[PDB]
Amino acid sequence: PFVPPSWAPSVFVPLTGLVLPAIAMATLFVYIEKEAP
Amino acid sequence: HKLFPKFSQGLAQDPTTRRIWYGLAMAHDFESHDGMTEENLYQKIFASHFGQLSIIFLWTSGNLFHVAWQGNFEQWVTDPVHIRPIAHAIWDPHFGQPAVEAFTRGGASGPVNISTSGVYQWWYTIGMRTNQDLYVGSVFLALVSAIFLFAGWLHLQPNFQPSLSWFKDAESRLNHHLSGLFGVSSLAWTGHLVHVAIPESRGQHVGWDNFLSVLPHPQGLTPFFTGNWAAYAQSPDTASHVFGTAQGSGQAILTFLGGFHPQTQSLWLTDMAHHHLAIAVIFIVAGHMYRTNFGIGHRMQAILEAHTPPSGSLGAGHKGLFDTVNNSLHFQLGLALASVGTITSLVAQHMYSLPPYAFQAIDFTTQAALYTHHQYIAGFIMCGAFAHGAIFFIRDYDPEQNKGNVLARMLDHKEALISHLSWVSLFLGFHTLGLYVHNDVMQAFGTPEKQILIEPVFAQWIQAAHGKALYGFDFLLSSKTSAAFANGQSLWLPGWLDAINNNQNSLFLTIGPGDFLVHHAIALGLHTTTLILVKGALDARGSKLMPDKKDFGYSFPCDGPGRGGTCDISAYDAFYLAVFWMLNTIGWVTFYWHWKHLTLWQGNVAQFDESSTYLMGWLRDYLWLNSSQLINGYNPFGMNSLSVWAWTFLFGHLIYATGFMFLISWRGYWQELIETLVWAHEKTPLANLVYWKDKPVALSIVQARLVGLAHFSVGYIFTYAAFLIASTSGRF
Amino acid sequence: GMLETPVTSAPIVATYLSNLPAYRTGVAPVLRGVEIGLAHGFLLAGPFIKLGPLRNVPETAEIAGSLSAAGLVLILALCLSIYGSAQFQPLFSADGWSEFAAGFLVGGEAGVAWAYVC
Amino acid sequence: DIAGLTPCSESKAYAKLEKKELKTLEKRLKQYEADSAPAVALKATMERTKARFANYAKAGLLCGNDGLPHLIADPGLALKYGHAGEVFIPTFGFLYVAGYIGYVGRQYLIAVKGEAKPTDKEIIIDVPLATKLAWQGAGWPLAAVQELQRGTLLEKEENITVSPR
Amino acid sequence: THIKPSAQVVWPIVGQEILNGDVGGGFQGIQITSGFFQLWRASGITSELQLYTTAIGGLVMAAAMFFAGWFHYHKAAPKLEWFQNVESMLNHHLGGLLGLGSLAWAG
Amino acid sequence: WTVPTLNPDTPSPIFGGSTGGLLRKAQTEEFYVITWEAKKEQIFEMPTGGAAIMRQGPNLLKFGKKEQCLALTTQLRNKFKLTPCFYRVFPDGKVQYLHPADGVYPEKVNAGRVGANQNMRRIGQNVNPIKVKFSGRMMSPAEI
Amino acid sequence: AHIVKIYDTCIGCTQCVRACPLDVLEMVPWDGCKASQMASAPRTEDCVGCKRCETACPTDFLSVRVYLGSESTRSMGLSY
Ligand code: CLA
Ligand code: CLA
Ligand code: CLA
Numbered sequence A: 001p002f003v004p005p006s007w008a009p010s011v012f013v014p015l016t017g018l019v020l021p022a023i024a025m026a027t028l029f030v031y032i033e034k035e036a037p
Numbered sequence B: 001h002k003l004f005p006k007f008s009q010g011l012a013q014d015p016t017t018r019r020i021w022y023g024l025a026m027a028h029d030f031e032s033h034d035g036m037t038e039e040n041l042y043q044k045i046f047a048s049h050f051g052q053l054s055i056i057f058l059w060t061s062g063n064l065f066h067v068a069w070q071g072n073f074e075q076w077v078t079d080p081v082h083i084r085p086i087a088h089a090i091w092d093p094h095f096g097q098p099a100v101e102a103f104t105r106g107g108a109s110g111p112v113n114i115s116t117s118g119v120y121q122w123w124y125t126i127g128m129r130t131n132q133d134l135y136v137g138s139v140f141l142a143l144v145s146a147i148f149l150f151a152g153w154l155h156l157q158p159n160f161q162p163s164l165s166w167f168k169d170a171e172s173r174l175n176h177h178l179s180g181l182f183g184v185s186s187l188a189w190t191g192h193l194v195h196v197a198i199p200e201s202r203g204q205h206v207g208w209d210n211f212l213s214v215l216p217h218p219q220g221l222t223p224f225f226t227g228n229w230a231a232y233a234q235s236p237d238t239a240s241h242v243f244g245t246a247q248g249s250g251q252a253i254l255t256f257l258g259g260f261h262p263q264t265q266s267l268w269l270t271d272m273a274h275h276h277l278a279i280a281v282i283f284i285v286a287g288h289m290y291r292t293n294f295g296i297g298h299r300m301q302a303i304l305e306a307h308t309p310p311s312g313s314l315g316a317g318h319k320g321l322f323d324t325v326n327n328s329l330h331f332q333l334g335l336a337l338a339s340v341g342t343i344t345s346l347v348a349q350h351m352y353s354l355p356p357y358a359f360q361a362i363d364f365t366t367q368a369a370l371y372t373h374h375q376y377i378a379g380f381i382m383c384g385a386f387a388h389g390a391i392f393f394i395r396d397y398d399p400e401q402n403k404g405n406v407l408a409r410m411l412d413h414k415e416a417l418i419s420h421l422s423w424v425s426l427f428l429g430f431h432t433l434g435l436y437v438h439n440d441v442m443q444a445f446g447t448p449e450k451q452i453l454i455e456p457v458f459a460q461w462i463q464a465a466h467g468k469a470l471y472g473f474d475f476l477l478s479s480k481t482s483a484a485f486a487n488g489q490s491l492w493l494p495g496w497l498d499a500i501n502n503n504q505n506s507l508f509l510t511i512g513p514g515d516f517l518v519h520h521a522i523a524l525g526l527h528t529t530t531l532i533l534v535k536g537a538l539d540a541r542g543s544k545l546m547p548d549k550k551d552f553g554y555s556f557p558c559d560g561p562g563r564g565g566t567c568d569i570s571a572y573d574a575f576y577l578a579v580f581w582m583l584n585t586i587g588w589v590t591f592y593w594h595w596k597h598l599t600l601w602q603g604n605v606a607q608f609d610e611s612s613t614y615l616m617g618w619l620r621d622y623l624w625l626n627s628s629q630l631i632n633g634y635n636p637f638g639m640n641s642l643s644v645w646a647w648t649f650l651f652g653h654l655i656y657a658t659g660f661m662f663l664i665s666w667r668g669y670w671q672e673l674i675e676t677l678v679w680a681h682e683k684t685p686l687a688n689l690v691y692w693k694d695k696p697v698a699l700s701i702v703q704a705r706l707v708g709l710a711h712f713s714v715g716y717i718f719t720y721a722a723f724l725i726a727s728t729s730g731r732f
Numbered sequence C: 001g002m003l004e005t006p007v008t009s010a011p012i013v014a015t016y017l018s019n020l021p022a023y024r025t026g027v028a029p030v031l032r033g034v035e036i037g038l039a040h041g042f043l044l045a046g047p048f049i050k051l052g053p054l055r056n057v058p059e060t061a062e063i064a065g066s067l068s069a070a071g072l073v074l075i076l077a078l079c080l081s082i083y084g085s086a087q088f089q090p091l092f093s094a095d096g097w098s099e100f101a102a103g104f105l106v107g108g109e110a111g112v113a114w115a116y117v118c
Numbered sequence D: 001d002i003a004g005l006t007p008c009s010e011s012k013a014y015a016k017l018e019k020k021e022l023k024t025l026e027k028r029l030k031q032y033e034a035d036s037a038p039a040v041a042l043k044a045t046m047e048r049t050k051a052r053f054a055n056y057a058k059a060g061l062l063c064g065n066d067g068l069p070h071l072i073a074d075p076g077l078a079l080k081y082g083h084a085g086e087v088f089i090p091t092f093g094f095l096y097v098a099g100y101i102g103y104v105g106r107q108y109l110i111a112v113k114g115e116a117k118p119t120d121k122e123i124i125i126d127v128p129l130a131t132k133l134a135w136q137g138a139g140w141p142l143a144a145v146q147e148l149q150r151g152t153l154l155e156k157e158e159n160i161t162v163s164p165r
Numbered sequence E: 001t002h003i004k005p006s007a008q009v010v011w012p013i014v015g016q017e018i019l020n021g022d023v024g025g026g027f028q029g030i031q032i033t034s035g036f037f038q039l040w041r042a043s044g045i046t047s048e049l050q051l052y053t054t055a056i057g058g059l060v061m062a063a064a065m066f067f068a069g070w071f072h073y074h075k076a077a078p079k080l081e082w083f084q085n086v087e088s089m090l091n092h093h094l095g096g097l098l099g100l101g102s103l104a105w106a107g
Numbered sequence F: 001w002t003v004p005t006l007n008p009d010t011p012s013p014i015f016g017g018s019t020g021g022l023l024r025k026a027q028t029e030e031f032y033v034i035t036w037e038a039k040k041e042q043i044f045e046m047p048t049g050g051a052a053i054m055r056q057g058p059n060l061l062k063f064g065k066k067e068q069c070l071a072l073t074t075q076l077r078n079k080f081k082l083t084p085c086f087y088r089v090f091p092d093g094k095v096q097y098l099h100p101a102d103g104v105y106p107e108k109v110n111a112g113r114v115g116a117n118q119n120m121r122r123i124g125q126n127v128n129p130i131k132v133k134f135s136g137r138m139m140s141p142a143e144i
Numbered sequence G: 001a002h003i004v005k006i007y008d009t010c011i012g013c014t015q016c017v018r019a020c021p022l023d024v025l026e027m028v029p030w031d032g033c034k035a036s037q038m039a040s041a042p043r044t045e046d047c048v049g050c051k052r053c054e055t056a057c058p059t060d061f062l063s064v065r066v067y068l069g070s071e072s073t074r075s076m077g078l079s080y
């Protein structure tokens, strides 16, 4: 019971290609520009 | 001011875009963070090494998982000569239907990539037969990666932080590593080979189900405890054995036969078993050398204090070097990188000529890819060894704790060192370039009989000393009446001789004047790169142009235009200048390797022997000739499977060229241009309502050198990898 | 001083720039956002339809063009949101820019939806 | 012979390359007149080609599997098998002329350092002193080993070095 | 149409003689691509003698130019306000140089 | 000598207006204001590009950085033999006088100055970088 | 801010002071040299690190040294 299904590239490749890069770059850009207290 | 980076408040108070890049580039240089102590340094290094371990095991589990789910591994093992290994499937929504048709090669459902990394031969040799074994291995290695990640989190917690005395305990670490991590791991790998990998090649499944009920040898442990160890070498595999079946099989588990298996053209599994068993015993004996808390053992500082010769030829000898290796981390990293780079060169040199895995060396693209991969890895690691040695001299070297020993006496005669490296570099360059230009002029003027062809009689003398009967020297292994020939004849020589007198393998290839000229070009590249790296390590404390260079550090831009101008004067800049020569030298060794093996694999070694003695033969018969099917990967008539390597070939030429911009053009042009851009943004209406938070400036000088060298090296690697994979896979 | 110019200091240019919704100084940031979005999504719907990868397949060119335009408007609204999150720590405040980014999202999706009907 | 190399007078690809070059030259020759200047130039080219192949086969050179002369660089192997005139006698000839040039330059430097304008003699050459040292430099190995044995070949540690030496 | 323009020949030493190729006309040399042959045919030159005479003439003019240099620096060197007569310089160069140049060439 | 004050109502030199003038640093951080008294009306070169006529009497220019004010000071001091002084102005209105902060120009010795940042040793007598490791920050050995 | 140091080999030639484009250095009374003048760096917050001072110094080795430290808006020479 190891095999991921046939629709798994069509979801996982745009996920880590677009969505997680967008969330990552947004979170990192907000972290870079944060003022120290 | 801003938070990032949290390790440097000097960088956190930077109002520019320099802060982001210098927070990225200084994140892992823990010695120069705010409030860094020594215990904190060693603890963060230990946790970081756990993080690297977890990333390595996650990488291997991902290779296993994508081969098990998307590869053709259960179909590859039946006919491994005619079936191409699949790496991973392609889901690219930018494709068109000709690309989906052309990358659906066979036997696959959709578009797939054909692997060159050679993992199918290694996994099939060590006993993998099904995809489910690869799934179990991937799940196991993902679990091991999670364990190392949790241990990296765990040994930073305050009830689990090791003391400084735990890290500087050298005798316990060498004893435990040389005993356990080397010998017990090699013994356990001998156990894996004997219990699983040798019976899998005999056609017998041995898994976790039945390994406690299948004897590796028909008389288990009675020859081992009787001392009748030659019983485990009786009846080896026949020279008509089909690998993976029982036809022509044997009973032995620990032989020493020599040479290759006849079908797979690879090393015998029983030879590799007795290899790992012998070195396992040797490492477990070697790991009982140093003095831990048991009274017996060697004391390393006493060994270093002892080895000082009379007449003072080494001065104080090795006195005071124990407190410079144990106290410094850059010295240890320099030793480690020197060793690992030389061992990586060793891995490449011994895996092309003595291929270990079954049906390796008939997959030619795998051979070329593995050799080129580990040679460039070794080149980068050797440059890093010399770089961290210069960092040792700048940061950690105390001259009063080294008054008179060998390390100070290296700084005492550094001018003779750099001068004689300069002499051998100039000699090899003048005469190698002069012989090549001479032979090019002889080939141009139509008279090849005039060209200087020096025969490599010394390496041919070595090949005759190893048993090659082509050059007629007939001594020590090539003469039948020799003592070494007669003593080794019963046991390991009949395989070694049969494998060394074959001209169809890479075991001690036939050499000539092209091989002469290229080995002297290789010596030129090595001695020149060593000149730049050694000169950067030794002039790091200071030169006559800059006597206080140790006061600025390792990586500073320059010292200004005064005193004639001092550009690229730091030791970092010597590293920067030596990476170009490293890329040059590995490019020479891989052009040479690849072209001699292409002429071997096609059949016409006379083409290499005739065309390698002059550089136009190189440019015409290796670069122009072997890049016809590459650049025809896509064209206005269509495309095929090599279009990705053509696009990557152009991609590498482009990144190379873009790195030339950072290497040639320098900062102040770009800073004036950015000042005009700042004016243009602040004056444009309806866009100046949006305003930057970090002030835009140009890249710094050191940053420019790093970015230019980075684009340079990435384009270099992608260009040659695209050409090598495309030529070797398209023409075979 | 600043260089006096009939392009930077023209009266009719100054009145035209005062009439555009980034300058009215007293309208809500939600209203500025929805007007800027109704302009920009309506103009961005065009080239995805006329030049995109589905431009020659009938009955689906305008659908895929407007859907990609809506995705780009969502990316632009995320960019506005992270710009306001990084910049301020009525239009030039955290609450005002968040209202402006939400208004740009609503107005841009409405402009793309109106361009699909047109 | 050495390293499985046949002699060039026995090699067949050597004669094949000789015939091929003569064939290319006569194919270029056969499109001119008999007693014209391109014909005389190409016949002199063919004469030099035949003389060069006869001289290379005469000197006992070793050819390979492609018919090209190979050189032997080992003193004892070449002195044993009669190949000393290709590396060994050329390397001592080169060391003679290279040490000649170096010794004449060194004597010019030491001759011009003992004046009030050493740099001005370095830019503008003292031609009689340069010709005198150029003629006297024929006994440079004897004078070199004599300056070696007296300790005047070397400067002492009055040299320029860096602060960590 | 079937002879390659060539005006450079190499001496027969060290094998560089091969560069003297078959350019036609019973000649061996390096094919030139400067285009002097077409310029000479367009000017109406037909014999080598006229080219030789032009060579001697150009050498004489070179000697006159080096004498003019030495003369106008060492013997009779113009004053500054001579050089600053730019109106006169334009008149003389537009009339005499371009004008009389193209007039005499049309002649 | 006493510290002078800034007169904001000082007439500026005759200048048509450049693109190399002030930016948002003048409104958000600081801008620097130079002042000199001229003997006659004469054209000088503006350090931001272009020519300008100075007025007879007091003059007033504002620049973006200190090096522009030093360049104009050096030009007006070596070519015209004048004695200028330039200030530091904050957007609150805070005025910081400097150059000459002593009143006498720093290119000649004056009593009352206190020597700062003077190491009383040679440069070869600095310590090695091993002696200053694991402090609170990066340190060159010349810092001690 | 950059680090500017003055060493006791100074001969009070004032060359460094008249070379700085930013007015960071000045000459103080001293008794260590015949000129009775020593340089001093009381305003290193405005120093950009151009090293004109090091070029102007005649002594061997240098008596003024600029160690490029942390960057600010003044040390980067930004007019914006
Ligand atoms: C670590 C090595 C590694 C690499 C280089 C790849 C590469 C790939 N994977 Mg594979 N994957 C891996 C391990 C790896 N995988 C493992 C161990 C599993 C089992 C959990 C999977 C399960 C998996 C599935 C189900 C699919 C892929 C797919 C792919 C392809 C598309 C990229 C993607 O969307 O993956 C997404 C990655 C995952 C779903 C699993 C990775 C999760 C780990 C824990 C992430 C580790 C974090 C990383 C170290 C740092 C990230 C943060 C940093 C960037 C800031 C790409 C070839 C797709 C494909 O086959 O296309 C044809 C696809 O459908 N992978
Ligand atoms: C064996 C392990 C090892 C370890 C533990 C270290 C540790 C260290 N090194 Mg050393 N070094 C090593 C090997 C190692 N190195 C190797 C293999 C090289 C040769 C490359 C070097 C050469 C080297 C130099 C020249 C320097 C160091 C420095 C350092 C220190 C800081 C690193 C840092 O913060 O930069 C963070 C690293 C980065 C931000 C990397 C940037 C990305 C690089 C340029 C590669 C970009 C290629 C890109 C990934 C390709 C993408 C292609 C795309 C198409 C996908 C740290 C002590 C520095 C130091 O000690 O200063 C005093 C320093 O100057 N190292
Ligand atoms: C193909 C390009 C190229 C060439 C030929 C060289 C050649 C050299 N490099 Mg350079 N290098 C290069 C690229 C190149 N490099 C690049 C891209 C970088 C990165 C910036 C470097 C960085 C670098 C460093 C850091 C160092 C070198 C050094 C050297 C010298 C090494 C010793 C030697 O082999 O002498 C043999 C000489 C040659 C191969 C040059 C040819 C000389 C010709 C044959 C003589 C003149 C012929 C003819 C009569 C001239 C007529 C011209 C006419 C106008 C008068 C050699 C001159 C090192 C050095 O100086 O060692 C002493 C050294 O430390 N190089």
Ligand code: CLA
Binding pocket: B094, C047, C048, C051, C052, C053, C054
């Ligand atoms: C820069 C040159 C360039 C141009 C003109 C194009 C054009 C195109 N590409 Mg290609 N592409 C390019 C570079 C370019 N590409 C590169 C370098 C790559 C590799 C990275 C690609 C990879 C690629 C892929 C994979 C695909 C395309 C596709 C396309 C087509 C549709 C793209 C689209 O819908 O965007 C949307 C368009 C816009 C958002 C337009 C914005 C620009 C506007 C007009 C500027 C307006 C300024 C205005 C005059 C100012 C007035 C001011 C006033 C109001 C005050 C279009 C023909 C698609 C295709 O199918 O090809 C036919 C497609 O699938 N491209």
Ligand code: CLA
Binding pocket: A013, A014, A017, A018, A019, A022, B093, B094, C048, C052, C053, C054, C064, C065, C067, C068, C071, C072, C074, C075
């Ligand atoms: C690595 C991740 C990744 C993935 C999965 C895609 C996928 C796609 N791109 Mg590519 N693209 C990428 C990276 C990626 N891109 C990068 C890095 C570049 C720059 C080099 C490009 C440059 C590019 C261009 C110029 C074009 C594409 C296009 C496409 C579409 C293929 C054409 C088609 O026939 O689809 C059919 C198309 C559709 C069904 C409509 C697409 C609309 C999508 C599905 C909307 C997604 C909704 C989502 C909410 C958006 C926000 C996500 C964000 C919040 C994370 C496909 C969706 C084409 C396109 O946009 O098609 C209109 C196109 O013209 N790409």
Ligand code: CLA
Binding pocket: B457, B458, B461, D074, D075, D076, D077, D080
């Ligand atoms: C640059 C290094 C070098 C290398 C690798 C060689 C290699 C060789 N030499 Mg040569 N040689 C060299 C330089 C070198 N030479 C120099 C500088 C001299 C002048 C002193 C000689 C003078 C010389 C003589 C007189 C002879 C050789 C011979 C040989 C061959 C076998 C030697 C042997 O087995 O001893 C191991 C190799 C070494 C110790 C390397 C140094 C070689 C020394 C100088 C001479 C060794 C001669 C050897 C003792 C005699 C073997 C007799 C043979 C019939 C077995 C071997 C190909 C012999 C030969 O002709 O064989 C066919 C032979 O008779 N050499």
Ligand code: CLA
Binding pocket: E042, E043, E097, E098, E099, E100, E101, E102, E105
């Ligand atoms: C309009 C100017 C002009 C043009 C187009 C020509 C054209 C020609 N000349 Mg003539 N010539 C001219 C004026 C010109 N001439 C003048 C002023 C002189 C005296 C110096 C000569 C002396 C001369 C000689 C001795 C010879 C020629 C020859 C030729 C023919 C050969 C090709 C050539 O010269 O390139 C074409 C040249 C140009 C395109 C540039 C000329 C520009 C002039 C110098 C300045 C004109 C500026 C003008 C006001 C605006 C034009 C702007 C721009 C478009 C050029 C060609 C028909 C050869 C011949 O007769 O072959 C059959 C030949 O042997 N010319």
Ligand SMILES: CC1=C(/C=C/C(C)=C/C=C/C(C)=C/C=C/C=C(C)/C=C/C=C(C)/C=C/C2=C(C)CCCC2(C)C)C(C)(C)CCC1
Binding pocket: B331, B333, B334, B335, B338, B342, B385, B386, B388, B389, B390, B392, B393, B537
């Ligand atoms: C800078 C620096 C550094 C570094 C260095 C380096 C990087 C080095 C490298 C090195 C190397 C890289 C080395 C190598 C070595 C090797 C060797 C030395 C080898 C040898 C070998 C042998 C000896 C062998 C022999 C043999 C043979 C050949 C065969 C027969 C048998 C036998 C085995 C005998 C350090 C850290 C110290 C620190 C200080 C600074």
Ligand code: SF4
Binding pocket: G004, G019, G020, G021, G022, G023, G024, G025, G046, G047, G048, G049, G050, G051, G052, G053, G054, G066
């Ligand atoms: S660096 Fe520039 S500023 Fe700092 S002292 Fe030398 S000159 Fe004056």
